[PDB]
């Protein structure tokens, strides 16, 4: 009943989640990514300057993406911790 | 509608609540008497026996003393376990 | 039919299982490709991005590069989150 | 479903519990108490010698009773830990 009732409440935190957008940057702002509350990647932008250095570009891309996903996950976990 | 991260968060939250409740239980005293008050037992809310007092008069009748000890102790154990069942259902509720 | 001590034991057991599963998840690699294989992304089972490889040809067309990155990344995120939902339901099951 | 299914299984560990008896001793065996698997106190025995020293008697009684209850509780918790 507990877990099922919580499952029912997690669905309420969906129409909220789906609209909420969080942006993470890296490489001095040369990479920007945005995730919605559902964890969907809804924006990705790379400064042309980074095309000159693929290896750095890939590192900054991973940094920004992991920060954004970390935020989605922390939100999932923290809302669950509080609910019960 | 739940993913593994949410489940881990719920488990952590439940364990936090559980520990907070156990500390409160440990601080709660329940006293049971028998033998016209000649036996008194006290338990904490974990079910640990924390005090036990027997009237000197009962030292003259060990048979009665044992019966009254068992009566008070069982009343106390039943009471604490009923509280502990209630708390499990109510925490989940 | 459950008392507070049993609930605490269950919570502890579930947290042990949860941690064991998370360690296994962290060791599992999922790879998604897009752009005819010109983009490859790898996630672990926690959803951390652990590798990212882009063909040098895409450096000539950032518009395409971004589209193919987003496609592969979203495919990977969806896959890991589906696994993580499944695991929550199945652990409980 | 999990908690409810476990609740259903805890009831199976009742007809087993109710019959199983565990004995705890203290005061060099001058106190003996027995609990069943349900946590009911089903036996208590005090050596006549202890009637000569009520304070020691009460201490040994508490020692034996707490050891026996500890055993009941550890059993409850350990069977729950393993089940899920």
GROMACS .gro file of C-alpha atoms in nm:
model
  354
    1UNK     CA    1   0.000   0.000   0.000
    2UNK     CA    2   0.289   0.233   0.094
    3UNK     CA    3   0.494   0.168  -0.223
    4UNK     CA    4   0.179   0.168  -0.443
    5UNK     CA    5   0.052   0.494  -0.288
    6UNK     CA    6   0.398   0.646  -0.344
    7UNK     CA    7   0.386   0.519  -0.705
    8UNK     CA    8   0.055   0.705  -0.742
    9UNK     CA    9   0.217   1.023  -0.605
   10UNK     CA   10   0.526   0.994  -0.829
   11UNK     CA   11   0.285   1.019  -1.124
   12UNK     CA   12   0.162   1.355  -0.985
   13UNK     CA   13   0.524   1.475  -0.992
   14UNK     CA   14   0.521   1.415  -1.370
   15UNK     CA   15   0.320   1.702  -1.522
   16UNK     CA   16   0.537   1.923  -1.300
   17UNK     CA   17   0.860   1.744  -1.397
   18UNK     CA   18   0.795   1.737  -1.774
   19UNK     CA   19   0.777   2.117  -1.791
   20UNK     CA   20   1.068   2.201  -1.557
   21UNK     CA   21   1.399   2.253  -1.740
   22UNK     CA   22   1.748   2.261  -1.589
   23UNK     CA   23   2.056   2.378  -1.772
   24UNK     CA   24   2.418   2.267  -1.708
   25UNK     CA   25   2.726   2.428  -1.860
   26UNK     CA   26   3.089   2.333  -1.901
   27UNK     CA   27   3.405   2.446  -2.079
   28UNK     CA   28   3.361   2.802  -1.951
   29UNK     CA   29   3.011   2.801  -2.094
   30UNK     CA   30   3.114   2.664  -2.434
   31UNK     CA   31   2.888   2.361  -2.374
   32UNK     CA   32   2.532   2.387  -2.257
   33UNK     CA   33   2.284   2.105  -2.208
   34UNK     CA   34   1.929   2.106  -2.072
   35UNK     CA   35   1.725   1.823  -1.922
   36UNK     CA   36   1.356   1.826  -1.832
   37UNK     CA   37   1.225   1.679  -1.503
   38UNK     CA   38   1.163   1.348  -1.677
   39UNK     CA   39   1.536   1.318  -1.758
   40UNK     CA   40   1.492   1.384  -2.130
   41UNK     CA   41   1.778   1.573  -2.296
   42UNK     CA   42   1.593   1.865  -2.460
   43UNK     CA   43   1.881   2.096  -2.557
   44UNK     CA   44   2.250   2.065  -2.646
   45UNK     CA   45   2.470   2.344  -2.772
   46UNK     CA   46   2.839   2.342  -2.857
   47UNK     CA   47   3.045   2.655  -2.925
   48UNK     CA   48   3.207   2.637  -3.272
   49UNK     CA   49   3.545   2.701  -3.104
   50UNK     CA   50   3.540   2.353  -2.956
   51UNK     CA   51   3.532   2.189  -3.299
   52UNK     CA   52   3.903   2.276  -3.308
   53UNK     CA   53   3.976   2.028  -3.025
   54UNK     CA   54   3.757   1.718  -3.035
   55UNK     CA   55   3.907   1.554  -2.724
   56UNK     CA   56   3.843   1.858  -2.504
   57UNK     CA   57   3.500   1.894  -2.664
   58UNK     CA   58   3.409   1.534  -2.570
   59UNK     CA   59   3.535   1.587  -2.213
   60UNK     CA   60   3.332   1.906  -2.167
   61UNK     CA   61   3.028   1.736  -2.320
   62UNK     CA   62   3.056   1.449  -2.070
   63UNK     CA   63   3.106   1.695  -1.780
   64UNK     CA   64   2.793   1.897  -1.862
   65UNK     CA   65   2.577   1.590  -1.939
   66UNK     CA   66   2.682   1.414  -1.616
   67UNK     CA   67   2.615   1.726  -1.411
   68UNK     CA   68   2.265   1.758  -1.565
   69UNK     CA   69   2.183   1.390  -1.515
   70UNK     CA   70   2.317   1.410  -1.159
   71UNK     CA   71   2.067   1.692  -1.101
   72UNK     CA   72   1.777   1.484  -1.242
   73UNK     CA   73   1.875   1.190  -1.023
   74UNK     CA   74   1.926   1.393  -0.703
   75UNK     CA   75   1.581   1.540  -0.757
   76UNK     CA   76   1.429   1.191  -0.802
   77UNK     CA   77   1.602   1.062  -0.487
   78UNK     CA   78   1.536   1.371  -0.270
   79UNK     CA   79   1.166   1.388  -0.350
   80UNK     CA   80   1.141   1.014  -0.271
   81UNK     CA   81   1.336   1.054   0.057
   82UNK     CA   82   1.094   1.324   0.174
   83UNK     CA   83   0.764   1.169   0.062
   84UNK     CA   84   0.814   0.881   0.312
   85UNK     CA   85   0.561   0.467  -1.138
   86UNK     CA   86   0.896   0.436  -0.965
   87UNK     CA   87   1.255   0.395  -1.068
   88UNK     CA   88   1.550   0.242  -0.876
   89UNK     CA   89   1.677   0.581  -0.766
   90UNK     CA   90   1.336   0.671  -0.622
   91UNK     CA   91   1.321   0.335  -0.444
   92UNK     CA   92   1.664   0.393  -0.288
   93UNK     CA   93   1.550   0.739  -0.172
   94UNK     CA   94   1.234   0.589  -0.019
   95UNK     CA   95   1.434   0.316   0.158
   96UNK     CA   96   1.676   0.578   0.297
   97UNK     CA   97   1.386   0.799   0.416
   98UNK     CA   98   1.210   0.501   0.576
   99UNK     CA   99   1.531   0.398   0.756
  100UNK     CA  100   1.572   0.754   0.884
  101UNK     CA  101   1.213   0.758   1.016
  102UNK     CA  102   1.258   0.410   1.162
  103UNK     CA  103   1.568   0.520   1.360
  104UNK     CA  104   1.396   0.832   1.485
  105UNK     CA  105   1.104   0.625   1.608
  106UNK     CA  106   1.328   0.369   1.775
  107UNK     CA  107   1.503   0.646   1.971
  108UNK     CA  108   1.162   0.774   2.088
  109UNK     CA  109   1.056   0.418   2.176
  110UNK     CA  110   1.373   0.369   2.382
  111UNK     CA  111   1.274   0.680   2.584
  112UNK     CA  112   0.918   0.559   2.656
  113UNK     CA  113   0.855   0.369   2.985
  114UNK     CA  114   0.568   0.119   3.031
  115UNK     CA  115   0.498  -0.016   3.383
  116UNK     CA  116   0.296  -0.330   3.464
  117UNK     CA  117   0.194  -0.439   3.815
  118UNK     CA  118   0.060  -0.762   3.958
  119UNK     CA  119   0.004  -0.924   4.295
  120UNK     CA  120  -0.199  -0.632   4.431
  121UNK     CA  121   0.093  -0.404   4.343
  122UNK     CA  122   0.358  -0.622   4.513
  123UNK     CA  123   0.530  -0.677   4.178
  124UNK     CA  124   0.619  -0.393   3.941
  125UNK     CA  125   0.803  -0.426   3.611
  126UNK     CA  126   0.909  -0.149   3.376
  127UNK     CA  127   0.996  -0.186   3.010
  128UNK     CA  128   1.118   0.061   2.758
  129UNK     CA  129   0.954   0.079   2.417
  130UNK     CA  130   1.219  -0.150   2.268
  131UNK     CA  131   1.093  -0.420   2.508
  132UNK     CA  132   1.399  -0.411   2.735
  133UNK     CA  133   1.325  -0.470   3.101
  134UNK     CA  134   1.463  -0.162   3.281
  135UNK     CA  135   1.328  -0.201   3.632
  136UNK     CA  136   1.193  -0.482   3.846
  137UNK     CA  137   1.067  -0.440   4.206
  138UNK     CA  138   0.927  -0.712   4.432
  139UNK     CA  139   0.774  -0.649   4.780
  140UNK     CA  140   0.977  -0.810   5.058
  141UNK     CA  141   0.657  -0.998   5.162
  142UNK     CA  142   0.678  -1.212   4.850
  143UNK     CA  143   1.018  -1.348   4.959
  144UNK     CA  144   0.811  -1.565   5.199
  145UNK     CA  145   0.615  -1.728   4.915
  146UNK     CA  146   0.824  -1.798   4.610
  147UNK     CA  147   0.537  -1.981   4.437
  148UNK     CA  148   0.321  -1.667   4.448
  149UNK     CA  149   0.621  -1.449   4.363
  150UNK     CA  150   0.689  -1.645   4.044
  151UNK     CA  151   0.325  -1.636   3.936
  152UNK     CA  152   0.301  -1.260   3.991
  153UNK     CA  153   0.634  -1.202   3.812
  154UNK     CA  154   0.517  -1.401   3.512
  155UNK     CA  155   0.180  -1.222   3.507
  156UNK     CA  156   0.334  -0.870   3.518
  157UNK     CA  157   0.613  -0.958   3.275
  158UNK     CA  158   0.378  -1.112   3.020
  159UNK     CA  159   0.137  -0.813   3.050
  160UNK     CA  160   0.434  -0.582   2.982
  161UNK     CA  161   0.577  -0.785   2.690
  162UNK     CA  162   0.229  -0.808   2.532
  163UNK     CA  163   0.181  -0.431   2.571
  164UNK     CA  164   0.513  -0.337   2.418
  165UNK     CA  165   0.475  -0.582   2.128
  166UNK     CA  166   0.123  -0.449   2.058
  167UNK     CA  167   0.270  -0.096   2.049
  168UNK     CA  168   0.546  -0.219   1.818
  169UNK     CA  169   0.300  -0.387   1.579
  170UNK     CA  170   0.086  -0.072   1.578
  171UNK     CA  171   0.387   0.140   1.499
  172UNK     CA  172   0.492  -0.081   1.204
  173UNK     CA  173   0.145  -0.057   1.048
  174UNK     CA  174   0.113   0.317   1.123
  175UNK     CA  175   0.457   0.413   0.997
  176UNK     CA  176   0.370   0.238   0.668
  177UNK     CA  177   0.032   0.423   0.694
  178UNK     CA  178   0.135  -0.964   1.064
  179UNK     CA  179   0.449  -0.761   1.127
  180UNK     CA  180   0.606  -0.582   1.419
  181UNK     CA  181   0.849  -0.287   1.424
  182UNK     CA  182   1.150  -0.513   1.470
  183UNK     CA  183   1.052  -0.719   1.166
  184UNK     CA  184   1.001  -0.401   0.964
  185UNK     CA  185   1.348  -0.275   1.060
  186UNK     CA  186   1.496  -0.613   0.957
  187UNK     CA  187   1.314  -0.595   0.621
  188UNK     CA  188   1.433  -0.237   0.561
  189UNK     CA  189   1.793  -0.340   0.642
  190UNK     CA  190   1.771  -0.643   0.409
  191UNK     CA  191   1.620  -0.432   0.130
  192UNK     CA  192   1.897  -0.170   0.168
  193UNK     CA  193   2.158  -0.446   0.150
  194UNK     CA  194   2.002  -0.587  -0.170
  195UNK     CA  195   1.967  -0.236  -0.312
  196UNK     CA  196   2.342  -0.165  -0.260
  197UNK     CA  197   2.441  -0.497  -0.412
  198UNK     CA  198   2.231  -0.422  -0.718
  199UNK     CA  199   2.368  -0.070  -0.753
  200UNK     CA  200   2.725  -0.206  -0.755
  201UNK     CA  201   2.626  -0.451  -1.032
  202UNK     CA  202   2.453  -0.169  -1.223
  203UNK     CA  203   2.766   0.047  -1.199
  204UNK     CA  204   2.960  -0.239  -1.365
  205UNK     CA  205   2.715  -0.277  -1.657
  206UNK     CA  206   2.790  -0.084  -1.982
  207UNK     CA  207   2.517   0.018  -2.232
  208UNK     CA  208   2.625   0.163  -2.570
  209UNK     CA  209   2.402   0.365  -2.806
  210UNK     CA  210   2.501   0.472  -3.159
  211UNK     CA  211   2.356   0.722  -3.404
  212UNK     CA  212   2.452   0.894  -3.726
  213UNK     CA  213   2.529   0.569  -3.908
  214UNK     CA  214   2.769   0.482  -3.626
  215UNK     CA  215   2.952   0.819  -3.632
  216UNK     CA  216   2.838   0.889  -3.276
  217UNK     CA  217   2.878   0.639  -2.992
  218UNK     CA  218   2.785   0.697  -2.629
  219UNK     CA  219   2.834   0.461  -2.336
  220UNK     CA  220   2.654   0.472  -2.005
  221UNK     CA  221   2.691   0.267  -1.695
  222UNK     CA  222   2.382   0.124  -1.526
  223UNK     CA  223   2.367   0.419  -1.287
  224UNK     CA  224   2.310   0.641  -1.593
  225UNK     CA  225   2.654   0.804  -1.582
  226UNK     CA  226   2.802   0.883  -1.922
  227UNK     CA  227   3.138   0.701  -1.928
  228UNK     CA  228   3.244   0.732  -2.290
  229UNK     CA  229   3.161   0.956  -2.583
  230UNK     CA  230   3.315   0.921  -2.933
  231UNK     CA  231   3.240   1.135  -3.238
  232UNK     CA  232   3.377   1.068  -3.592
  233UNK     CA  233   3.609   1.345  -3.711
  234UNK     CA  234   3.378   1.387  -4.016
  235UNK     CA  235   3.109   1.535  -3.795
  236UNK     CA  236   3.340   1.822  -3.695
  237UNK     CA  237   3.253   1.961  -4.043
  238UNK     CA  238   2.878   1.973  -3.967
  239UNK     CA  239   2.801   2.078  -3.614
  240UNK     CA  240   2.426   2.085  -3.683
  241UNK     CA  241   2.428   1.714  -3.772
  242UNK     CA  242   2.670   1.641  -3.489
  243UNK     CA  243   2.436   1.792  -3.230
  244UNK     CA  244   2.133   1.607  -3.366
  245UNK     CA  245   2.316   1.273  -3.363
  246UNK     CA  246   2.454   1.340  -3.013
  247UNK     CA  247   2.107   1.416  -2.882
  248UNK     CA  248   1.959   1.108  -3.054
  249UNK     CA  249   2.223   0.867  -2.912
  250UNK     CA  250   2.221   1.028  -2.568
  251UNK     CA  251   1.844   1.020  -2.537
  252UNK     CA  252   1.833   0.655  -2.658
  253UNK     CA  253   2.090   0.570  -2.388
  254UNK     CA  254   1.918   0.766  -2.107
  255UNK     CA  255   1.582   0.607  -2.199
  256UNK     CA  256   1.740   0.259  -2.198
  257UNK     CA  257   1.909   0.298  -1.862
  258UNK     CA  258   1.599   0.451  -1.699
  259UNK     CA  259   1.383   0.167  -1.837
  260UNK     CA  260   1.630  -0.081  -1.684
  261UNK     CA  261   1.618   0.112  -1.356
  262UNK     CA  262   1.236   0.114  -1.347
  263UNK     CA  263   1.233  -0.259  -1.425
  264UNK     CA  264   1.477  -0.327  -1.147
  265UNK     CA  265   1.270  -0.133  -0.888
  266UNK     CA  266   0.956  -0.332  -0.974
  267UNK     CA  267   1.146  -0.664  -0.991
  268UNK     CA  268   1.339  -0.618  -0.669
  269UNK     CA  269   1.005  -0.555  -0.494
  270UNK     CA  270   0.878  -0.863  -0.689
  271UNK     CA  271   0.250  -0.615  -0.237
  272UNK     CA  272   0.600  -0.678  -0.098
  273UNK     CA  273   0.515  -0.582   0.263
  274UNK     CA  274   0.173  -0.755   0.243
  275UNK     CA  275   0.327  -1.075   0.098
  276UNK     CA  276   0.589  -1.066   0.376
  277UNK     CA  277   0.306  -1.016   0.629
  278UNK     CA  278   0.147  -1.333   0.487
  279UNK     CA  279   0.476  -1.521   0.530
  280UNK     CA  280   0.532  -1.394   0.887
  281UNK     CA  281   0.205  -1.570   0.974
  282UNK     CA  282   0.356  -1.899   0.845
  283UNK     CA  283   0.644  -1.847   1.090
  284UNK     CA  284   0.386  -1.856   1.373
  285UNK     CA  285   0.287  -2.222   1.416
  286UNK     CA  286   0.663  -2.286   1.410
  287UNK     CA  287   0.738  -2.001   1.653
  288UNK     CA  288   0.464  -2.085   1.905
  289UNK     CA  289   0.609  -2.431   1.969
  290UNK     CA  290   0.980  -2.339   1.977
  291UNK     CA  291   1.111  -2.269   2.329
  292UNK     CA  292   1.438  -2.097   2.424
  293UNK     CA  293   1.581  -2.095   2.773
  294UNK     CA  294   1.811  -1.827   2.924
  295UNK     CA  295   1.993  -1.858   3.256
  296UNK     CA  296   2.166  -1.621   3.493
  297UNK     CA  297   2.317  -1.610   3.841
  298UNK     CA  298   2.522  -1.923   3.773
  299UNK     CA  299   2.204  -2.099   3.671
  300UNK     CA  300   2.005  -1.988   3.976
  301UNK     CA  301   1.759  -1.810   3.744
  302UNK     CA  302   1.606  -1.971   3.440
  303UNK     CA  303   1.347  -1.823   3.206
  304UNK     CA  304   1.196  -1.959   2.885
  305UNK     CA  305   1.027  -1.774   2.598
  306UNK     CA  306   0.839  -1.925   2.305
  307UNK     CA  307   0.888  -1.800   1.946
  308UNK     CA  308   0.595  -1.563   1.991
  309UNK     CA  309   0.779  -1.385   2.276
  310UNK     CA  310   0.553  -1.523   2.549
  311UNK     CA  311   0.724  -1.591   2.882
  312UNK     CA  312   0.632  -1.956   2.944
  313UNK     CA  313   0.865  -2.049   3.232
  314UNK     CA  314   1.041  -1.873   3.520
  315UNK     CA  315   1.233  -2.043   3.796
  316UNK     CA  316   1.425  -1.892   4.086
  317UNK     CA  317   1.658  -2.089   4.314
  318UNK     CA  318   1.546  -2.058   4.680
  319UNK     CA  319   1.900  -1.938   4.765
  320UNK     CA  320   1.833  -1.609   4.591
  321UNK     CA  321   1.548  -1.524   4.826
  322UNK     CA  322   1.825  -1.439   5.073
  323UNK     CA  323   1.937  -1.141   4.857
  324UNK     CA  324   1.649  -0.966   4.682
  325UNK     CA  325   1.865  -0.705   4.504
  326UNK     CA  326   2.090  -0.967   4.343
  327UNK     CA  327   1.782  -1.175   4.265
  328UNK     CA  328   1.621  -0.882   4.079
  329UNK     CA  329   1.943  -0.816   3.886
  330UNK     CA  330   1.978  -1.180   3.778
  331UNK     CA  331   1.608  -1.188   3.686
  332UNK     CA  332   1.653  -0.882   3.462
  333UNK     CA  333   1.970  -1.030   3.307
  334UNK     CA  334   1.802  -1.360   3.212
  335UNK     CA  335   1.477  -1.196   3.092
  336UNK     CA  336   1.666  -0.942   2.876
  337UNK     CA  337   1.883  -1.215   2.726
  338UNK     CA  338   1.572  -1.422   2.639
  339UNK     CA  339   1.387  -1.125   2.491
  340UNK     CA  340   1.699  -1.026   2.298
  341UNK     CA  341   1.694  -1.376   2.146
  342UNK     CA  342   1.325  -1.343   2.046
  343UNK     CA  343   1.393  -1.004   1.888
  344UNK     CA  344   1.711  -1.110   1.704
  345UNK     CA  345   1.514  -1.400   1.559
  346UNK     CA  346   1.232  -1.167   1.446
  347UNK     CA  347   1.481  -0.926   1.285
  348UNK     CA  348   1.705  -1.193   1.126
  349UNK     CA  349   1.420  -1.384   0.966
  350UNK     CA  350   1.286  -1.052   0.830
  351UNK     CA  351   1.632  -0.948   0.699
  352UNK     CA  352   1.662  -1.274   0.504
  353UNK     CA  353   1.308  -1.301   0.366
  354UNK     CA  354   1.365  -0.984   0.156
   0.00000   0.00000   0.00000
